């Protein structure tokens, strides 16, 4: 079964870490040397990793039953379909947000007998001591729902931590899933740019971020729709890296070459300390050319 | 060669709201005609109506705030900021297609987002100032300054504000003005249109908190990707247990992008089937092909 990537223009596809259209590609020497995102993680032969869902309907979602306690209210987590969360299969429930070290402003709705405005709750989930999604619970501020209420929660926007230990949001980092009690079990492994002059390609989307280190932008390593494609195809990985062309869909012109590694991420070689894929159009399609060795030398992409 | 995704149905999304599929149903009182504008695509990958490739566009609106005496609103663009063309679709791509109800929505500023002051809970009613085909809709409780660019997502729906009805019927589409995706009818010989159901916050819904669609969203992206030529009048599918490979039932998928089954002696059809199954392409068949009844009596 031959390997392929979707024949879909980039700017029609979603970020795999927030539900937002891709509007740019970038490399980052500052942030792109090690990356351990937990969403948008899947092998080229279609093995899902981390908390990564097949569908965007699960992404940046939390489901749980409300608990009321002295130190504050919170949620006892389930999977989004309502089935039980287990602490062996993953760092958190599938689709749980993976943007660390920031406040999450979220919208929750009652899943049973939804009456209207009073069954929608604008809540704040902080990443402090009682943030323990791996153990099956998070503390939630400004949550007025009664005990044992079943809620589906959606990420609305993010902002600097409430406890003031930093004043910006760095979306390149992931949460501490097990709190200070333990490291999470099935974390999608760290990624490093392998290869000579290679930089990891990050697909960017706009999102409401207050004081972001790259402003209102969230990076990921695959479009969401690629994840569903690889999980569908399960094409055997027949080489060390997949050579791709980024191609204009009308003119058929090759706009640059890229390597996709089995771990499920892409790299390019920037032109002489340049911005690499950022100057390319965003309405192109990636296309599989051939399996190549990890040492295969890419032609530089972008301006100097 | 034509294929459908090898993905379990309960891992996939509704194509009319961003919510996991948790059921399949047929409907006598609602399945006699449907003209949903989202989740519409041909088997060879031609998008129709307002249907996006990606769920990130679904049930969202983008536009610039206008202030008016009759009421504030939004001058619509596409979700990527580019101009909406009325000759291309009945509304911008991904516009909600749930008619004859109130849309309660959450809007955020796309420029210099500061926090809670740039998030707005708005009500979009479907009255005379609802004109998506032109490129504008009236919004209540919208306090943002004039020309503010906002990205808006659907939070919940409820009975119309003017009270001309007291319940929500998600089987109907809005009055856009158009170049609508065409109506779908059951094709004959006791075939019933299969609807994929997802839960959504609906106040006083005709089927409770449930939204129907004709295709999982990820099937839409798969067909747009593959563009497999249609080589017959219907694609015969098996719904299969992925662990045991057990054939749970037969379904026809038509070129227009919808599925049918035959229920067993006036029964519920696909409703009693497990929701973690996978559809698989068997072969191209003619209109003459008669499906084995599915489900219980």
Numbering used by the authors:
A (entry chain A): 230 to 533
B (entry chain B): 231 to 407, 414 to 533
List sentences quoted exactly from the publication behind this structure.
The crystal structure of the native DSV P protein was solved at 2.10 Å resolution, containing a homodimer in the crystallographic asymmetric unit. All DSV P protein residues (228–531) were built in electronic density map. The two P proteins exhibited the typical huNoV P dimer arch-like structure with the P1 subdomains situated at the bottom and the P2 subdomain situated at the top. The major structural differences compared with other known P proteins are at the surface exposed loops, including the previously identified A-, B-, P-, T-, and U-loops in the P2 subdomain and the S-loop in the P1 subdomain. These variable loops confer DSV and VA115 unique surface topology from other huNoVs. We noted that the P-loop and T-loop on the surface of DSV/VA115 P protein exhibit a higher extension and the distance between the two loops becomes closer. Therefore, the glycan binding pocket becomes narrower but deeper, which hinders the binding to HBGAs. Through structural superimposition of the DSV P domain and HBGA oligosaccharides with other known structures, we found that the α-acetylgalactosamine (GalNAc), the A epitope, and α-Gal of the B epitope are too close to the amino acids on the T-loop, resulting in an obvious chemical steric hindrance. Similar clash also occurs between the α-1,2 fucose of the H-type trisaccharide and the S346′ amino acid residue on the P-loop. Likewise, the representative α-1,3/4 fucose of Lewis antigen forms a clash with Y439′ on the S-loop.
